[PDB]
Structures are given as C-alpha cells and as structure tokens.
Amino acid sequence: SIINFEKLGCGASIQKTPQIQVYSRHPPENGKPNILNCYVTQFHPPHIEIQMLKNGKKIPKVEMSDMSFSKDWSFYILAHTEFTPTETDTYACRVKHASMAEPKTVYWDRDMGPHSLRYFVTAVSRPGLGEPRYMEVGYVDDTEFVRFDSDAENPRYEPRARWMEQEGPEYWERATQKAKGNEQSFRVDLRTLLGCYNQSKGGSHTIQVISGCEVGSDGRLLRGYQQYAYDGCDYIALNEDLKTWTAADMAALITKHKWEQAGEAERLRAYLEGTCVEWLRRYLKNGNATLLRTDSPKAHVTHHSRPEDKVTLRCWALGFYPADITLTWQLNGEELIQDMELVETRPAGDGTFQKWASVVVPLGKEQYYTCHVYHQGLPEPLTLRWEP
C-alpha cells in the first residue's frame, strides 16, 4: 500500500540519449518463428518513438512493454515483434528521441533473504495535449504486482500478478482513491515547479518518486526509500537515518524547510517502519509460491571469424532470472580484461534475461580459453569451452 504524498511546495513565482539493443528472444534459425526485440534504455524525457523496420519498411504491429524507470531516473522500454528470420532479410529498430538531432537506426546483427516493497511514481505534464499523465507502479522484489495509470476512462488500481487477485473489493477501491488523491498533489507540484526552476510554461516535465521499504529476514527495516526527482535529476530524498532530508539543489531547500516544520520525516518513518513492513508481509504470503523463483542460466559458446588469424569466442547465458549475473573469460587460470566485449543484460521478453561476453583469441587456440558463468541459481559456477 503506497503512502499519501505531501505536496513539495517549492515556492511561488537535461536530456539523456537512449541506448539500443536489437536481438531475438531465441537463437535465430532460418525458417523458425522467433521474436525480435528492441531494448531501449537510459533515455530522458520519457516520450520516445520506436519503429521496427524490415528491409527498410515499417513493421505494422509491434508490441511495447509499459514504460518503467531505474534508480538513476532514466527510462526504459522493450519493443518486440514476431518474425521468421531468413538469410537475406534485414531487420532494424529506429528510435526517435529529443536528445538526438536525427532518429537512431540500429540493425539486427546475428552476432549482437531481504524482501522489498517499493513504488515507482511518474507524473509527466503534456501542456495542450491534455492533463498530466500520472502512474503508480508497485514492486514486490523487482516483481511488478499492482499498477495505476491515469490515462484511462475510469482509471483504477489493477492487479499485475495473478496472486494479487485474492484481495477483496475494498483493497482496490481505497488504493485507487489514494492514487487519484496522489495524482492531484503531483498536478499542483508540476505547476509550481515551473517558476521555481525559471522554466517556460509550454514544455513537458516529469516528477519521479521511489518510495518503499526493504525488510530483512528478521522482519526489521533494513532501508527506507523516499526519493524525488524533477526532470530526471535529484530533488529531495530522505536520509538513511529516516530523520533528515538531502536536498539536491537550491529549489529543494524550500521543500526541506517546509517538511521539517511539518514533521514529514516522522510521518514517513512511521509509514516505512510500520505500514510498509506489514503490507509487504501480506503481499509476500499471497505470492510465496511464485516470487522466490530462480532460473539458472544455460550457457554455450559460439565461434565467429575475424580478419586475419583471429576468431571471436562469444559466451552466452540464456533464460536466467534474476538479471544479476557475471561472465568471465579465462586463459591459463587467469581472468581476461583487455580484448573482451560485453553487452548489458537484456530481457528476453518471457521473464528471463540474456547476456554474453566475447573475447578475441588466435585461430587454432580456441581450446585454451574457458568461459565462467556466475549466477545465484547455479549451485556451482558453469565452466565451458568452444566445442565444434
């Protein structure tokens, strides 16, 4: 259950480039249906235009994940489409974002204990286009379980995991009413934050909040979260002592002084140490059978030719959950660094993740190199080599 936010009341009166990965959900095989993914990360503002193209022309029906953001405040989204790869068909993903002068096109290259209840809140103004879009997203251990989107005719809190369907009508009635009330606070804050930052009146701006609690195995609060951001940059945040605030620039000092007089830090300490802890307990019970799952990575090495007498050994890790993983290449019992390339861990689209690490080795010396895969679901790290 999310907290009821207090208005920032700041007073009276920078863009990030997306990063793109284009890859198939499964290893591509000509003639075998698959899924083409376009994974876009690290961008801000959140408005983004994504097209998937086959042989230059726009693919008609592409699906999009709902947009989320990470702890660095940047946004990410997964676009995917169904496709059957061939040897000559060319696929690409084109992303149009304000941070770039020109749309970016990235082509598909076949070689490409503690628990937590946290709420990710977004309020984006779109002056002229309508009212600000407001969203509340709840996570039980990185797993989304509830969602509120004001961009509907009759916006309501919705279960996002089947185990949340047990909550009676009274739970969803009050959660939605809190969201609509919370939406109003961010509507007012968006308006006044304009003059506090000396910004023109016609642009789009965002407020982001991360609110929640991390609870150890003993049921005690490990860490409480209450962090605000305006336009993708730190604004104010409750400190680890849960008693004082860290304001990130001059505008946030009015909010900090106002919240000290109002005793807001103590209101949140009561929410985090209490209400947040007890609700996470109720949520964990309903989702016990599904939330604690771990999927071990399955690994394999592929072999790719290079100029002159070099080859590329690419070590794949597929179908693993959670996302955290480590891939290393070794020669003579020592770990390699210099000639080794990575990709950021990326979703497959089915709940599991993928990653690979490659290394350039001399031709004929492939059996001198061993890849190592470290994952929490593996009883012992995987070791494997290129096998023709």
Numbering used by the authors: 1 to 13, 24 to 122, 143 to 418
Sentences copied from the publication:
Major histocompatibility complex class I (MHC I)3 molecules present a diverse array of antigenic peptides, the so-called immunopeptidome, to circulating cytotoxic T lymphocytes. The construct consists of SL8 peptide linked with β2m and Kb HC in which the C terminus of SL8 is tethered to the Kb-binding groove through a disulfide bond between Y84C of Kb and a second cysteine within the peptide-β2m linker.
Based on an examination of the native structure of the SIINFEKL (SL8)/Kb pMHC I complex, and the structure of the single-chain SL8-β2m-Kb HC trimer, we introduced alanine substitutions at residues 63, 66, and 167 in the MHC I HC which interact with the bound peptide in the A-pocket. Positions Glu63 and Lys66 interact directly with S(P1) and I(P2) of SL8, whereas Trp167 caps off the N terminus amino group of the peptide. A hydrogen bond between the S(P1) hydroxyl group and the side chain carboxylate group of Glu63 is detected in WT-, W167A-, and K66A-SCT, but not in the E63A-SCT variant. Despite the loss of hydrogen bonds, there was little variation in the peptide conformation and the interacting residues of the peptide-binding groove varied very little; the only obvious differences being in the orientation of the side chains of Lys66 and N(P4) in the E63A-SCT. B3Z recognizes SL8 but not IL7, and therefore illustrates how peptide overtrimming by ERAP1 can alter T cell responses to a dominant antigen. The least affected variant was E63A-SCT, so we examined the ability of this variant to stimulate B3Z when ERAP1 was expressed. In the presence of ERAP1, E63A-SCT showed a significant reduction in B3Z stimulation (∼35%), consistent with trimming of SL8 to IL7. The peptide in both E63A- and K66A-SCT displayed low RMSDCα values (<1.0 Å), whereas SL8 in W167A-SCT deviated more from the initial position, with RMSDCα of ∼2.0 Å.
